[PDB]
From a paper:
[name] ([name]), a class I AaRS, is particularly large and complex. Structurally, [name] contains an aminoacylation domain, a [name] binding domain, and an editing domain, known as connective peptide 1 (CP1). HcLRS functions as the intracellular leucine sensor to modulate the activity of the mTOR complex 1 (mTORC1) by directly binding with RagD GTPase, the mediator of the AAs-dependent mTORC1 pathway. After screening truncations with different lengths, we found that deletion of the last 106 residues (N1071-1176C), designated as hcLRS_d106, gives improved crystals that diffract up to 2.5 Å resolution.
We were able to obtain a co-crystal structure of hcLRS bound with a tavaborole derivative, a previous reported anti-cryptosporidium benzoxaborole, AN6426 (37). The structure was refined to 3.0 Å resolution. The IC50 of AN6426 to hcLRS in vitro is 7.7 μM. In the structure, AN6426-AMP is well accommodated in the editing pocket with the AN6426 moiety mainly binding to residues from the editing active site, such as Thr293, Thr298 and Asp399. The side chain of Lys 464 from the I4ae insertion is within the Van der Waals interaction distance with the ether group at the meta-C of AN6426. Structurally, this I4ae insertion makes the size of editing pocket from hcLRS much smaller than those from bacteria LRSs. One could imagine that if we added a bigger group to the meta-C of AN6426, this group will clash with the I4ae insertion of hcLRS. So it is theoretically feasible to design benzoxaborole-based derivatives with larger groups that will target bacteria LRSs but are too big for hcLRS. Taken together, our results showed that it is feasible to design benzoxaborole-based derivatives targeting specifically [name] from bacterial microbes but not hcLRS.
Residue numbers in the entry: 7 to 118, 156 to 916, 932 to 1061
Amino acid sequence: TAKVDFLKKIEKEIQQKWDTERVFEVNASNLEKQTSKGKYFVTFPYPYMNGRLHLGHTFSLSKCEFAVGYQRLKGKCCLFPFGLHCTGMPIKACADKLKREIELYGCPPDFPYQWGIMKSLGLSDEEIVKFSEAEHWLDYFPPLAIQDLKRMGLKVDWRRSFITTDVNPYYDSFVRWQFLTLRERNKIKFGKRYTIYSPKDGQPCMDHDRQTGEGVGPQEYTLLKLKVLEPYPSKLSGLKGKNIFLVAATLRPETMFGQTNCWVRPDMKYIGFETVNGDIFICTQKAARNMSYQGFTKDNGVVPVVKELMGEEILGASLSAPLTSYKVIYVLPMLTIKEDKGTGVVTSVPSDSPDDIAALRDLKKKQALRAKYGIRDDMVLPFEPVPVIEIPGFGNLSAVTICDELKIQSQNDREKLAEAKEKIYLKGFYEGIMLVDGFKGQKVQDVKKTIQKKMIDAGDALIYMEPEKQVMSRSSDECVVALCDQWYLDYGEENWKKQTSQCLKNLETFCEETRRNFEATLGWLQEHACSRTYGLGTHLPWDEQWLIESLSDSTIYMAFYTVAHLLQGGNLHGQAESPLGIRPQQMTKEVWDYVFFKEAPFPKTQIAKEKLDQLKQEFEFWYPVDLRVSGKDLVPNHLSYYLYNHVAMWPEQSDKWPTAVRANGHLLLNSEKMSKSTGNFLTLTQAIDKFSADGMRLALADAGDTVEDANFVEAMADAGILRLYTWVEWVKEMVANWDSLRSGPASTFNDRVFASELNAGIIKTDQNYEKMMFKEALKTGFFEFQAAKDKYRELAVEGMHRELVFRFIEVQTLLLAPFCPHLCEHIWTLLGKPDSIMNASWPVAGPVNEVLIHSSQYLMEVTHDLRLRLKNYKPSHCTIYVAKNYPPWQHTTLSVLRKHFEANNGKLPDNKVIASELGSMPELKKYMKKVMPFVAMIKENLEKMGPRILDLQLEFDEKAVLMENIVYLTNSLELEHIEVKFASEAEDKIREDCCPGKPLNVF
Ligand SMILES: CCOc1ccc(Cl)c2c1[B@-]1(O[C@@H]3[C@H](O1)[C@@H](COP(=O)([O-])[O-])O[C@H]3n1cnc3c(N)ncnc31)O[C@@H]2CN
Ligand SMILES: CC(C)C[C@H](N)C(=O)NS(=O)(=O)OC[C@H]1O[C@@H](n2cnc3c(N)ncnc32)[C@H](O)[C@@H]1O
């Protein structure tokens, strides 16, 4: 427990040191003077402030945190800014939900929630009332996020932090300029479009204000109106003299020529309501709600209902249907009808729909269903399927044939009906050929929309838009599809889309899966409704009654990052003094044009030229954005809008378009979904309190470098804490006994081995950092680094070398610094370094000798084998025999393997061909049993450690390697003497079975 607290103590000390030193603050006026190795601009999509930051946010931003930590050692100057996204409706929604209980009840409120979740966050009874207003959220949560992040030690220039609502004047002016330019370039358009709409909120319901179906969009249905004829059914007697229609939903209008009846569910609650011209429609409450928000009613969102009934109350009614050859068709029941899809009313196409002929045959079979629901013989019997569409492999009556073949006799055969449905599922879309007059011999794909238009023009059909999948909003409202007027960004313009496609070609995606995601969302995207009326954000500068949603004021704010330090100077809300003395309102459209457009003319403003030139310098220096890391959930929405807006804002400058975007999966905690409802959920401040910042960052580095879901394990973090504490204690011990270390020329065998292993680790870890594979970087630059050091300490019989251990400590610290900068800074000052580790450079690797490394692996294997043989037959004297060359039979088989390897670019044939060729060689008579195990071992070690096992002699001196460590071998084996001999001296068994690299031994 005290180790975590020691880590936290060191962390707080070093954090205060960094703050006073002002190390991570960068200025373009000064950095542009000393040309170094370039700039590195990383961004994290600023998070929503409707709560505290948790572990997923920190895992996602850890990518660019470690990236800055590494890239600064390679000489570049880094810009890691951090904003806070307050725009949106959840903040205001929760504030108003809190005010609801504040005003309708008391403090505390009497029940029979929001106050409970606020108190669960540890707020005082008297301090939750202040949260009835959103401004208190804006004053409360952003400072806590900043505090936690600073406590994590992010290499962030906090002077460039800001807030995103109109409360911030500077960001407000920035978004004003952005959308003014967008509308000036014909990117924003006012129009009436279809959109997922929240009735309780009164505005479109986009991706980040939903709770179910993150990307689900509307779906189109052909809505047939079947007129009800007199004599009306009983329940509709009160609606005499008016026009009554059954509104059936369908997805295949071209089939309506073969209608025989109409299916309703007898146990469903159907609603008859009045439309815009006074007619009466019969559907369900949800269908009517959607139609009312699609202009089907006199008032938007008002459904004047004039009758409620059950499906049984409609059975037997007489209908007149379009297109069909039957002049009067009847309403009949069907048991299997979904209440989530359509209008609850289905048309009957018995020729090409399996469910229809199934239900019709069930009604034609027994009088039980006809008398249970009141169906006489005129409503079912004189109705036969009508040939309309012919599939070549089935005929004019496809459903009839495939349901006679699958031997179905009921409408409740879910499996058989699903199979018959999928068999002819799409074979009607393309290969169908019409048969009715006016369309004989036509491709169904070539006539379906024409017949739909035919029915819509004659007033016999309409267009009904319903959510494809069920959608739920943040405010617990079930959304509809509304055809409403709004301002939208025109992401469907072919020119804009092709330019963004080129930008995607130029963009760096660390895997092809993300490129495919981008291609799909680029081919699928169209108009994007961007206007809200309820919530926080920035108003349209010309339509002050509309606000701008959260997914649209966040497209090019990275440009605002480059000047936020000179505009508002660290004060989040932008309410403090300006460092350059620029008033919040003084930033006009032309001023922003001059700042962000290189070829823009200097306008007439009271601002001095030096200030605006400094701003333009900052922008043109820091741009473009090199890297942007995020979760794979922001690819279908935010990142595509980001590419689009960068293309539209700087259309002549592809060099200002984003460079790279790295996406990761979502974080699991202890291999389980992280959620507050299940128990496992860590916020950033909780995680720091529990594991220290460096321990948390270490366990975060090992989480996951793929796009598959990442795994944060607590036990791994605890083990990392233990290892960090032991490492710091080891460093302290070594600094204490500086004079107890061997010095001079480091010439011993293990000195050279360890030098080469250290350099190879430097090279491998540099590589793994370049690929942002931080798990592999931690593997090669810490765990395996420490394993090499432990082997070096264990094998150094004459004690470790002074300069070599100093170099190992220096380099291990320089490698670990991007993961654990606090511990590394502390150990840096422990070594007596003059400057901070934040000024260091990436360590230079020396020469790497593969022969030494392979020999050390050999010695490891030999020692493991010796200790395993020590298990059985009190020992005191051992003798090892080492073969200088392979014995004759082994040499012959290995020469055959070498020949075959040389034949075809290093592929060894099947052991069958090998055994044949070796059984054809006369010398190999006494050895055919021993042959194939040799080939098996050779293939295993070829797959394991390269083709070097095909060498006829080891690349290094085997006996000399053993002699360099005879002392250690004798000590660790608890023996008195070890005799290393050249195999030729041994007896017959050993001399015959010994081979180089596999030396034998006997006690
Ligand atoms: C896929 C089989 O659909 C076919 C297949 C062949 C033919 Cl010829 C047709 C249809 B289809 O009937 C409607 C509509 O198109 C189709 C809509 O599919 P989805 O399950 O609601 O997603 O199901 C039917 N449907 C619509 N609402 C329904 C509901 N609430 N319950 C059950 N079925 C419904 O139109 C014609 C005449 N029936
Ligand atoms: C620019 C604007 C339109 C974006 C908007 N402000 C926003 O999205 N704010 S946010 O707090 O929900 O997320 C911000 C970043 O943190 C990642 N992330 C979030 N949760 C998890 C998780 N459970 N697991 C893994 N990563 C996660 C997420 O992808 C994103 O890059």
